[PDB]
Symmetry: D6
Subunit: 170 residues, 12 copies
């Protein structure tokens, strides 16, 4: 029922809405301010940048569900950072696990990456737990790494390896 596809110029109004939402951008440790023009100019700049893959998530109806991104893709170390956003209107419909799996399938069966890692607020224990259920393991607890809502907060760095993902069941 859910499909990941490449980000397109016609999806930019959707991204713009997310990028200016304080409560969504807080999960990505980003400032919730971006004019359409900054957004669109940065999109243009990175069209041919091989160090990132940005995906939009659609349901069968072709409602826009959210965003998945693989960034800082490094081709010697074969690692990338994974980050995901599910739009407020679709939060709590049970789609996260499916989309995490899609991202990992893409990473490990298409791009042939070795390692995917992510950052998650220590004060978001529900997401830490979801990630662990999907196979990620804590490799760091970064102290006062990000300033979020008036104070410095700690974050977990978590990872999963291609070997585990592909071979755990063997």
């Amino acid at each position: 029922q859910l499909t990941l596809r490449a980000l397109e110029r016609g999806d930019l109004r959707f991204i713009h809405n997310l990028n200016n939402n304080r409560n969504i951008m807080s999960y990505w440790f980003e400032e919730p301010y971006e004019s359409f023009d900054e957004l669109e100019e940065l999109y243009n700049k990175h069209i041919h940048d091989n160090a990132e893959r940005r995906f939009v998530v659609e349901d069968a109806q072709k409602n826009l569900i959210g965003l998945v991104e693989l960034i800082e893709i490094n081709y010697i170390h074969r690692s990338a950072e994974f980050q995901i956003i599910i739009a407020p209107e679709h939060q709590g419909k049970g789609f996260a696990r499916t989309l995490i799996n899609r991202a990992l399938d893409y990473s490990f069966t298409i791009l042939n990456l070795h390692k995917i890692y992510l950052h998650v607020a220590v004060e978001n224990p529900k997401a830490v737990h979801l990630y662990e259920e999907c196979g990620f393991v804590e490799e760091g607890h970064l102290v006062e790494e990000f300033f979020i809502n008036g104070r410095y907060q700690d974050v977990k760095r978590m990872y999963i390896l291609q070997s585990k993902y592909l071979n755990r069941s063997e």
Copy 2:
């Protein structure tokens, strides 16, 4: 009240900005010349799309009437300071929006941008505005003598500030 929102300035808001920027009585509050072609406005908007030293916001109510403008300018990377400036459109002056909007600007400065100090300039000959700012936590740190040429003569201005520690501990 909670009805008001601050959001990034967008290209579709420029006709509203053009109107304020060509209004002598609105520009006088910012000590700026009330002359700007749409082309100058737009080309400067284009020039500063990626300028990290400013944040320009448009104020809207629940029905999306444009209420005014809030800007943080001269944002400094080391000293962690910025200048706050505001414009409430004539038809909305005196409604009680100002205190709310000042608090929103400070929240953005202190809880998102992680700045140390916000300062502003306001005319000595506008004592009721000075009073309002005092009630909002700003304190006078300077009284600049004959600083700006306005309406045929030079005027004095107060320089007023507030620090992050004070805002966050009130």
Copy 3:
């Protein structure tokens, strides 16, 4: 209160093009009455950010375009500028010049903080000379054969007014 000056905009260029291609009108500015819309628009573009001029269109309360007022050669150090004005043919003879001249001076002296505004006017236009005198300008020069206009060289008055005089 009825007449207002506002910055020249791209949508006003057809009006300007019309005045700029009118022989009678451009003779008051000592300018050649030929300018394609492309030359006009390209020069407009070129000077968007030029701090040395301020070009204004005059509008009545109904938003009819009445004329143009310009402050040019604005100098940073000397604090002087040249003033020029055109009232469209369909609106001359309605007594608007005085109001418009005073608005230009108010702008120069209360907003731009200039020290001196000067202008040039044909010696053969004594009515305009008299009007400028009534508004406080005084002759400081009688330029001999300064401009070629309709087959002959003509003389022009240079007239000025200071900030100190205007504000007092």
Copy 4:
């Protein structure tokens, strides 16, 4: 009833038609081939070129009657070449003399030129005679100057001076 005005981009389709007409271009010693794109690109190139003035001729109805041009304007010698075309549909309505006078008025009373000259085929004696009636005098008979319709042809160069034009009647 006739008016000369600056050539505009919206008159280019009219010029294009003239510029591709063998029997009209022969009077100007030009090749009758010009794509709209060549025409338009050359127009663009010369927008700010002070060495030429191109005019379109209209009647009161605002029918396009023809073209008058002053080219190779030199500002030390104060001379320019005059050339005119009346569209086929308006030839023989007696407009040439009026338009020659307009061009001379412009040259001598606006641009303050000293001398206007023109070239006319020796085999176009009617035009040589019209020009003489309007004050031009032959200063040259250029031998085999131009290749026109399969052979080299001779042309008259003719001129008029500002002094004569302005002062003849005095």
Copy 5:
């Protein structure tokens, strides 16, 4: 006679975008199935004048887009090129491949004056290998763990045909 090859055009890019973002299809070309329309269109623009490739869309008599055929890495001296073809899902199983393969060879050999056409095909696609053999291609290589596809490295056949064989 029903199917035709013609040059790829800008109006065909939505069709290509669809195939280029389809995982199943792009697996036949050993390519990553992600390409924004902007990347596609920008690369199209970049290669307009590139003599080293010829990209074709396949159309039936009704002008339905059936697939794509490409001649790439066309070499000037060696007179070789790589052939690749995609038939859209909605049109596979209709027996068009043979016709299309022959059209690509006709183009290469009767129009471009090439000496050799080669292709790559997954060892795990024996039906495609057999089809290419029927059309005159012969295996010249069995490339070991050449491409990573769906979580593992796969082997591919390299197959070729010469102009001399095709024309005789």
Copy 6:
């Protein structure tokens, strides 16, 4: 007949040119590859707008149906020569337009461009076209051996010419 006209190629004629340029049976007569995207065609058209070494014409009948193409290429400034090439669209082949169009091209070459020599190439294996050109005054000056690769083999072509003096004295 006199119904046919030659005129400069224009941007609005390019869809017609695209059609001919992608037709294998039309391009074979010019020894050119029948593949050209509209973008290649248009960008090359743009590139050559001001190229004085060619003249490209479109043929139209009285009702403005597009009949074909005539081109003079490789026009040389010193040697006063050019290559003539023609295409009559399939639906108009065999109507008797060709002789007229060849005469129009020669008239343009000799009476307007003042060229000395026009030459052309035509397939030896198309003897009836060779004959037509002979009837039109062209004479064979070469028989180029295996000059062009066409349809899987090399073909010979005649090189045929006509001089200005012959055309103008017939």
Copy 7:
């Protein structure tokens, strides 16, 4: 004995040395890091910028003594910020007062400015006192305005007016 002249490209090595000196840049509230290339590229950028005047100070021997700058020159308000540096090797030779006077003469008798202001650390009372002796008066005491050597510090803003400078003695 001392002369102020425009900054030149051959003075850039001198400026580079000052700009990378922690104890000199602290007086200007600037970070003491600037590659020659950043310096030179910024110089190039600002060649025609009318909002600043940068001067080098020489003695009769043509030793480079220091730097004087007028920045943020505003031509409606007629104000500018003054800042000065005397090289370490020339500190304490009694040149500051002379160079302050030179700067004020330039400001008020050449550029026709109305007001010059400066910023000086509250913890640099000797300089505050020198400035007062030269006619500047405190108009502000800016609280925690700048981060300097591990902590936020206060600064005085001080000014002098053209009227006072020119007319005090009258």
Copy 8:
């Protein structure tokens, strides 16, 4: 015969830079005495092909640079220009001004075919006013508080001479 005017060249810019940064000299031209060599050289470059000015350096027989003469704001239609001249400090008081003024007029009137040359001169420089009168210039304006110079606004004479007067 000893003194000559020739076009300004790139190798003369150090001389100009020196005069342009000299307070006493630039006061005669009502200009700010600050110009980096880069601003000077960049402006020189910008105006290489500008037809509205002619800048000259003055040389004696030994090729010593004596001064500068400029014809600026040359107008195409009105056939007027402004003349300005500087004689380097080391060469003032040698009586060269008269010769140089006449050379500038010869250029304007016998080469550029101008109708009018005008200049501006400080009212507080009566010796220069007298010299220009001796060379045929006459006052046509007394501009009030036209330029700010050394802390105060000063008046300047505008003076002119016509081609007809010069050639006869």
Copy 9:
């Protein structure tokens, strides 16, 4: 000791940097590929002249021998963090410069740039370097699993940090 100095990287230091960047044993400490043409180095240096997100320093002794390199990268404007990296040239390893240089980098970060947190990466399999950093006040916040490909296999790295408040209060 006090003999060592940090200063901005300059173009004349690039041959020294080229040497380190092409040394497999030096680059291994930074998890980077030891291949960089002088042209790549120089062009990237040019590209980043005005990049405010990094500070690159060269270390010199009293006699100006080049000792090594210190860099603060990924400097963030909001979170007030940066990554610290160091290289001591082979001939100067083991001399006792490292502790000094680490303290100099922290002083710059905390007393000039006003950063909140400095972190670094160091190989788990280089325990003595880990120990040194611990003695210098860094604490382990992560142990990144198979993070980098080095010499034919993946290696783990410690992520270690220090905060401004700790450095400034020691």
Copy 10:
């Protein structure tokens, strides 16, 4: 004599050209203003490197002294005409080089460029030059009235020509 050679103008000849172009007495023969900075000369030389409408030559003797300049300008592609102009440097005037150089220019025009007609302009008030040209085969085709402003007044000029057929059959 046969000692003289014509060759293409080169960049290393521009100082010689600068000298002639700034000489009032040399430029008067061409009716041009004797003012040209080296930069104007050089930049125009650069602009016209590929201009096919002119051929500029430098004259040298056997010992390579620069003798003068010969130019063919306004070379027309259809009409097969050009304007001939010459300058003999002052020190070489009166030596008998002129007739030779005129014949060399005509040989180039008629035997290499295949032009039909060469014309020139020469002052009516320089009758001995007119005579020389007549002896060289040029014939007067015009007497242009007050064509050029020279030395304070307008002067008349002869327009003289020679045709290819006459030159080639003498």
Copy 11:
């Protein structure tokens, strides 16, 4: 230990130009032996930042240039690259090839983290084929009439080695 690979630099281009214009040498790479220094240098410039290749020059202990080694068509996903090597004529026959081949493999497998290195070698060069076999490469293709070389089409072996085999 005597021989080293280092990145190609601008100062090494004369050496490369010499090899690139040598017919005998370039025949081993199936390349045309013509390249002006300007084409070479311009292409070098173009590819400075191209991540898909690594070009190396080989030096002995005395810094004499011995040869060139290149890793090209480096692929991001498949983790494959093509290896090619040239030893200058004056240095062939000294037994350096083995060392250099192993250095290229060490780079590919221990630094670039590649999965597969392949190469092409003329069937008519059995000595080179044997040397590559000794270094662990195995034939995966025999490409028929792949390259035109000295008047005829020649066959080439494609040979490969995997990371797993090299590291174990």
Copy 12:
């Protein structure tokens, strides 16, 4: 003893000398005028043009002997035009046949071309004969193809095929 190698920028002075020599350029039907700047700019333009190969000929001493070029290389028809120049000082030393063979070897054994053709004046029978001895055969006698030294002249077009060159001896 003779070697062909790619043309280089340091050979341009040699080419310039040839390109300005009337008696050498006549063999190539080119105008003998080319400034160094035109030459060098055209060289630059064509650096990457795959449709030509330009070679210089050296002897063992590394004297520059002449030039060989393959131009208009077409990669579908596999044909190119061959042209050669031997410098005047080396004419008649018997090098032509060797250099023709070198060019043919390059064409047919390196570039894999099918056909090489050339143009040679009918009035240069010695060269026609040399070419025939080297295997070229006349395929055309082009009538009044080129204007050379005051009149139109005829030229032979001659060719040789790869099949003949490679297989004649088999």
